[PDB]
Amino acid sequence: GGLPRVADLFEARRPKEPAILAEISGIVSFGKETKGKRRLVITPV
DNA sequence: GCTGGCACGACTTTTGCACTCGTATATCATGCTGTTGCACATT
């Protein structure tokens, strides 16, 4: 809020927690071999 | 006859010369780059 945001909007700064998006067909894939790294690897065919 | 500005032979001044020894901070906000640590595929 406030208006360190007309500045924040125009510089198009990436926020702290971006929301992920998807592609044409998001079939159920959950995560294959979800190791200690980033888990829930979604692989929509 | 009286006087007042011009040149000459000593003196005096300048100049290249280039040559060496010789007290402090405490604005954040952001973006970019570099180093190191760690997960994943390989023979």
Determined by cryo-EM
Residue A30: how many CB atoms within 10 A of its CB? 10
Q: After which residues is chain A broken (C to N over 2.5 A)?
A: none
Q: What is the DSSP code (8-state) at residue A4?
A: S
Nearest to A44 by CA among A31, A18, A35: A31
- CB-strand contact A15/B, under 7 Å: no
Amino acid present at A22? A
Amino acid present at A9? L
Closest-approach nucleotide to residue A11, Cα vs C1'? B30
Amino acid present at A38? R
Q: What would you report as the CA-atom Rg of chain A, rounded to the nearest whole angstrom? A: 17
